[PDB]
Amino acid sequence: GAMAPSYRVKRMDIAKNDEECVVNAANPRGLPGDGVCKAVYKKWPESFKNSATPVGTAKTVMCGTYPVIHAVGPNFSNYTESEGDRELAAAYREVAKEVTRLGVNSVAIPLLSTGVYSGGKDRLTQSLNHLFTAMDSTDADVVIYCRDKEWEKKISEAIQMRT
Ligand SMILES: [Cl-]
Ligand SMILES: [Cl-]
Ligand SMILES: [Cl-]
């Protein structure tokens, strides 16, 4: 574990992370996809061998010895708010189990279901709070990756408020 487990946020492409493993914002079919998923496919294509997994779950595939944890958040265009909320919380609980099993000291993570699976809604607080609920009991350093300048400021404020 990290000596003083922390949360940090960086505004940049998660394919350039400086952590021991990465979480992909995956689709259930293991396809290259869009956004974070397409960047992950270009950087670690070998990790898409048998990466298909259901909504609300995470499946890890190694690229060399580097773990890629494919986490499938719900597409809010298809789920109701209540069911989508439950599956989004579940995907993050599975990421915490995988990070613990892998024994890593750090993990790079995006906010699940905040891009094309958001159903056109701002889900920063919803997704980040489910991330904290799952990851708080782990001892890995967590680095959250985002692309928007206003989202970086809001995620940073949420992290600092709890310290
Ligand atoms: Cl970048
Ligand atoms: Cl998304
Ligand atoms: Cl973003």
From Swiss-Prot:
It is a peripheral membrane protein. Changing residue 27 to A: Partial loss of mono-ADP-ribosylhydrolase activity; complete loss of ADP-ribose 1'' phosphate phosphatase activity. It is found in: Host cytoplasmic vesicle membrane. ADP-D-ribose binds at residues 13, 27, 35, 115-117. Changing residue 13 to A: Partial loss of ADP-ribose 1'' phosphate phosphatase activity. It comes from the Viruses. Residues 4-163 form the Macro domain. Phosphorylated by host on serines and threonines. Changing residue 36 to E/F: Almost complete loss of mono-ADP-ribosylhydrolase activity. Interacts with mRNA-capping enzyme nsP1. Interacts (via C-terminus) with host G3BP1; this interaction inhibits the formation of host stress granules on viral mRNAs and the nsp3-G3BP1 complexes bind viral RNAs and probably orchestrate the assembly of viral replication complexes. Interacts (via C-terminus) with host G3BP2; this interaction inhibits the formation of host stress granules on viral mRNAs and the nsp3-G3BP2 complexes bind viral RNAs and probably orchestrate the assembly of viral replication complexes. Interacts (via C-terminus) with host NAP1L1. In the N-terminus, the macro domain displays a mono-ADP-ribosylhydrolase activity. The central part called, the alphavirus unique domain (AUD) has a zinc-binding function. The C-terminus region, also called hypervariable domain (HVD), is mainly disordered and binds several host proteins. This intrinsically disordered domain contains 2 SH3 domain-binding sites and 2 FGDF motifs necessary and sufficient for the formation of nsP3/G3BP complexes. Seems to be essential for minus-strand RNAs and subgenomic 26S mRNAs synthesis. Displays mono-ADP-ribosylhydrolase activity. ADP-ribosylation is a post-translational modification that controls various processes of the host cell and the virus probably needs to revert it for optimal viral replication. Binds proteins of G3BP family and sequesters them into the viral RNA replication complexes thereby inhibiting the formation of host stress granules on viral mRNAs. This is Non-structural protein 3. It comes from Chikungunya virus (strain S27-African prototype). The lineage of its organism: Viruses, Riboviria, Orthornavirae, Kitrinoviricota, Alsuviricetes. The chain holds residues 1334 to 1493 of 2474 of the full protein.
